[PDB]
Design a protein around this ligand. Structure first.
Ligand code: NA
Ligand code: NA
Lengths: 259, 259
């Protein structure tokens, strides 16, 4: 493997996407490679978490279709927090339809996801039309996309040639695609981010197929860039001290890998 | 292949799911195996289409995340039409996350999909946790699910062993899973429905990877049960006469296959 570059140096790579470079520079400024999976159903709790944990995170990942009281003004308030504390907003929509449909789902409907999400993600199962359709909205809005190359869950079919196809599709749509959701490093090109869910400090899983690995395993041994942490933080009593524990774990694993 | 049973006889199979049997009986009563893909962004147009075309269709497929003016009362009015004209409502949500997440996306948020959708669909890429999570909402609500075994779009990765995995997952979750979105017959078990999108009378595609086959190819040669038709109907001037053309095509292909 080529010699590892710092996040700050990766932010300067000739082929880097502007959204990736903004992310990489705030990761190095803030010493955080933690993405908070803000898995709550109340706008107040989402906003209180974003404000308190904002300084500790590089990214806040939302499922806005689980917010009981979603409005676009909630997302305006989230953007204010994102700008104040310096983190990106990633809507974990997992687009997975034909290109003509995802185009509408990204721009339109109640959620107007493209209006407030810096990043979205997509499954590669439909073929590259899924990326084509999203990019016809996302490119004019200066957004980025992550392709789901592997999943954390038991029985995942995102393996082998499927994973290779995701990497190829990302390479070929680099104007819009900034990286992967994956369990490890899947691309050797340093311009691409790797974000990894299924992360907790302790061993375990849930009863619906989620499986966990630690920040040291995921960042240090498996070579990913960012950990996505949900229940490990959200279910804790003190979510701020939980986020700090995850931040320091992921940051030190990165530093020790960087040498 | 075993001798083909009529829709009415399939509705009586020992292992048939109640939602599948309701569907099969209305298909045979109404002489329709057409599912309308109601791909519009206005509630008024969705409701006017559902009323006018209701008699011609067995199912109305929605993308409620593309409706600019979604409210739950729109879905109440759609249910009234579904009951009046006898068709099922299928929300084409393509759930594709870990089980713990899809559970919430199905029951909760603004859309409360499980409250009004007879059928939903899911990708199998996350492993069977996706089905497990949906069924914890769907079983108590007496709903059914379709697993996406193949896709119509260029570059689709839902082929080979992926398709085989979808069929296995459906078999093993038959209390909830009633069939497939697929391009052909993928299961030899007659209790399972096969629904096929990417359908028009004329050859062609779109520029975002959609590819078309005719009702005679899909139902007659490829052995699917139901055609899903969107732009072939929606973009026509007279949507009612378009739906009738598709209905008669799909019904006759079925009858000629039945012998
Ligand atoms: Na995930
Ligand atoms: Na489809």
């Amino acid at each position: 493997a080529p010699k590892e570059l710092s996040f700050g140096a990766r932010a300067e790579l000739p082929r880097i996407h502007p959204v990736a470079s903004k992310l990489l520079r705030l990761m190095q400024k803030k010493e955080t490679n933690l993405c908070l999976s803000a898995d709550v159903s109340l706008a107040r709790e989402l906003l209180q978490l974003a404000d308190a944990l904002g300084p500790s995170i590089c990214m806040l990942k939302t499922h806005v279709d689980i917010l009981n009281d979603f409005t676009l003004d909630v997302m305006k308030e989230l953007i204010t927090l994102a700008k104040c504390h310096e983190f990106l907003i990633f809507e974990d929509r997992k687009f997975a339809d034909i290109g003509n449909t995802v185009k509408k789902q990204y721009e339109g409907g109640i959620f107007k996801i493209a209006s407030w999400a810096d990043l979205v993600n997509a499954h590669v199962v439909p073929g590259s039309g899924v990326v084509k359709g999203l990019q016809e909205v996302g490119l004019p809005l200066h957004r980025g996309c992550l392709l789901i190359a592997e999943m954390s869950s038991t029985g995942s079919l995102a393996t082998g040639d499927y994973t290779r196809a995701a990497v190829r599709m990302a390479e070929e749509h680099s104007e819009f695609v900034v990286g992967f959701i994956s369990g490890s490093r899947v691309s050797m090109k340093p311009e691409f981010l790797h974000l990894t869910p299924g992360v907790q400090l302790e061993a375990g899983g849930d009863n619906l197929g989620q499986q966990y690995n630690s920040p040291q395993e995921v960042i240090g041994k498996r070579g990913s860039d960012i950990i996505i942490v949900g229940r490990g933080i959200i279910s804790a009593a003190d979510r701020l001290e939980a986020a700090e524990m995850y931040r320091k774990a992921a940051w030190e694993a990165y530093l020790s890998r960087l040498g």
